[PDB]
């Protein structure tokens, strides 16, 4: 149901920009690890938890974009004339991120080395998160309440987006500099968060409904946490701790 063709185009372009500025930043690490045939420096816990995050998000986006049964539940819950708040680029990002996270896991087994296996409090996290998901799956099964369950997978992606930015900012604080500050990478993350927020807004301007912001509250909090923490990193680096 697009009303405006220019808006639908704009929604598609900023949507593909969000996929570009976010999915592109997976490659520098992969290139580095091949060149060096080693992953002594990578945070193994982070890659593991970023697979969990990217899988929860992937389940939500792929299921809502390709299941008519789940879409029917989306129209029952949020409204008859509602546009599905998942775009082709949301599905593309999720599938490409899971693929790039599994390739980095391949690089960690095949190159590995050093004294890194990390897998304590982190592994623990994976257990509790996939266990929680599993409890929720058996709750959604006796009524086939599939849209409620993929709304949990998206809440899990929100949790893990916090697990991404918090410990990082926390390191920069408990320490001092912004050590590892990548202007390029930080600019592109910011870009993906603005583009993904702008996409949702363009969808709201066209249909004239803010319900997409609750129908996909995972994507609304993903973009906002990303932008918030990027501004913080900027504000660490450009002010609070120069060097």
């Amino acid at each position, epitope marked *: 149901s697009w009303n405006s063709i220019p808006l639908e185009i704009s929604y598609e372009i900023v949507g593909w920009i969000a996929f570009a500025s976010w999915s592109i930043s997976f490659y*520098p*690490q992969l290139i*580095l690890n091949f060149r*060096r*045939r*080693s992953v*002594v*420096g*990578l*945070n193994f816990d*982070f890659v593991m938890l970023n697979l969990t995050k990217h899988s929860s998000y992937m389940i939500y986006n792929v299921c809502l974009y390709f299941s008519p049964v789940i879409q029917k539940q989306y129209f029952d819950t949020y409204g008859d004339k509602e546009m599905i708040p998942v775009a082709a680029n949301d599905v593309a990002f999720s599938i490409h991120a899971v693929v790039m996270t599994a390739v980095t896991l391949f690089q960690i087994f095949i190159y590995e*080395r*050093g*004294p890194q296996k990390v897998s304590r409090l982190a592994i623990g996290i994976v257990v509790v998160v996939w266990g929680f998901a599993a409890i929720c799956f058996f709750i959604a099964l006796p009524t086939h309440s599939w849209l409620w369950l993929i709304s949990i997978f998206n809440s899990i992606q929100v949790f893990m987006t916090c697990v*991404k*930015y918090i*410990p*990082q900012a926390k*390191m920069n604080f408990t*320490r001092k500099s912004t*050590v*590892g*500050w*990548s202007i390029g*990478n930080i600019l592109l993350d910011f870009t993906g968060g603005l583009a993904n927020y702008l996409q949702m807004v363009i969808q709201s301007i066209d249909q004239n409904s803010w319900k997409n912001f609750y129908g996909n509250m995972g994507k609304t909090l993903l973009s906002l946490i990303s932008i918030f923490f990027d501004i913080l990193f900027m504000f660490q680096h450009y002010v609070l701790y120069p060097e």
Partner: nanobody
Amino acid sequence: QVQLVESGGGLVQAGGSLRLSCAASGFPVYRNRMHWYRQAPGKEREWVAAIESAGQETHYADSVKGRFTISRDNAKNTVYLQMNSLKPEDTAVYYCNVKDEGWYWQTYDYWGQGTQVTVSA
């Protein structure tokens, strides 16, 4: 403001032992996971050994495992690579290393200058 100064390297005969040293400025060695790496002519940087931060735990490459022993003298802020049973193979510039490991972004490696260890058969 962090500095890593390698010394102890030079010529030794195959079978011989050397005790590489790494003087550290701007940071405590006991409060950090310290690494040793090596670069041979035409080869790529090889991870060699590492010691755990607040603990005696040590990990070694399969090429040096058993022969090389990485220790730390906190009372001199220096890391040591007691490289024993050496072979001409081990000919490489050994760098001591300390990383500023990141959560998400790239990890910052602080290298030293280097000390050639040339093993002569």
